[PDB]
């Protein structure tokens, strides 16, 4: 699909707020993912021992991983759709090593939208949320096509 420049600017204006504190946003998004869809935590051999939200919040390693994840996504979003180079390594690791189905990328997209809706109503009204959804749908479309090329059904 293709986003307009106006849609990308709605995406990037909320991402600017995420970047005030990427670590805290990443904690909220990964915890939301794990609480809403507990099966996703089982894909993380390093983190699946965490039993409760308190343990997740206290995990320095989970915090650092959330920064890694949201910084990678932010670099993709800043490409405004021209993200082929960024998707190659991410698709290869997520298809082949981590084995993350497209359904689970849908779940993390839902968690991202949920947390931005909660934290950022000033920059995440209905039009801005639709633009973010379109950007995440494009990310998932393009990663699913790369999954197929790499041999993984997703
Ligand atoms: C917005 C979507 C996502 C982004 C941008 C993203 C990004 C990343 C990055 C940058 C890494 C480290 C380098 C690499 O291994 O590729 C990583 C690792 C990983 N990702 Fe993701 N990821 C996403 C979604 C998911 C989802 C939904 C799952 C699981 C349900 C997942 C599971 C993993 C695992 C298991 C690792 C390894 C963690 C470790 O170091 O122990 N990823 N991800």
d(CA 71, CA 101): 21
Cβ neighbours for 56, distance < 8 A, ≥ 6 positions apart: 27, 30, 31, 34, 47, 50, 62
d(CA 22, CA 25): 5
Question: Which atom from ligand 1 is nearest to the alpha carbon of 93?
Answer: 16
d(CA 111, CA 32): 6
d(CA 3, CA 28): 27
Which residue lies with its CA nearest to atom 41 of ligand 1? 46
| 65 alpha carbon – ligand 1 mean position (Å) | 8
Q: Using an 8 Å Cβ cutoff, are 27 and 66 in contact? A: yes
d(CA 5, CA 118): 25
Say what the resolution is, in angstroms. 1.3
Neighbours of 127 (CB within 10 A): 10
Q: How far is CA 144 from CA 100, 118, 139, 151, 152, in A?
A: 11, 28, 8, 11, 9
Residue 72 beta carbon below 6 angstroms from any ligand 1 atom = yes
> CATH fold of 1-154, please?
Globin-like (1.10.490)
| 67 alpha carbon – ligand 1 mean position (Å) | 11
Backbone angles phi, psi at 77, to 5 degrees: -65, -40
Question: Which atom from ligand 1 is nearest to the alpha carbon of 45?
Answer: 41
Cβ-count burial of 2 within 10 angstroms (0-12 exposed, 13-18 middle, 19+ buried)? exposed
Cβ neighbours for 59, distance < 8 A, ≥ 6 positions apart: 47, 50
Helix, strand and coil content of the chain, in percent to the nearest 5, comes to: 75, 0, 25
Residue 100 beta carbon below 6 angstroms from any ligand 1 atom = yes
d(CA 102, CA 28): 21
d(CA 37, CA 125): 25
Known binding positions: 65, 94
- Tell me the chain's radius of gyration from C-alpha atoms: 15
């Amino acid at each position: 699909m293709v986003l307009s420049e106006g849609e990308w600017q709605l995406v990037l204006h909320v991402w600017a707020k995420v970047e005030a504190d990427v670590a805290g946003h990443g904690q909220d998004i990964l915890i939301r993912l794990f609480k809403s869809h507990p099966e996703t935590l089982e894909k993380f051999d390093r983190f699946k021992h965490l039993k409760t939200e308190a343990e997740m919040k206290a995990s320095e390693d989970l915090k650092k991983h959330g920064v890694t994840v949201l910084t990678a996504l932010g670099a993709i979003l800043k490409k405004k759709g021209h993200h082929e180079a960024e998707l190659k390594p991410l698709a290869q690791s997520h298809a082949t090593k981590h084995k993350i189905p497209i359904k689970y990328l849908e779940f993390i997209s839902e968690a991202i939208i949920h947390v931005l809706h909660s934290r950022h109503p000033g920059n995440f009204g209905a039009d801005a949320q639709g633009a973010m959804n379109k950007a995440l749908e494009l990310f998932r479309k393009d990663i699913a096509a790369k999954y197929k090329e790499l041999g993984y059904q997703g």
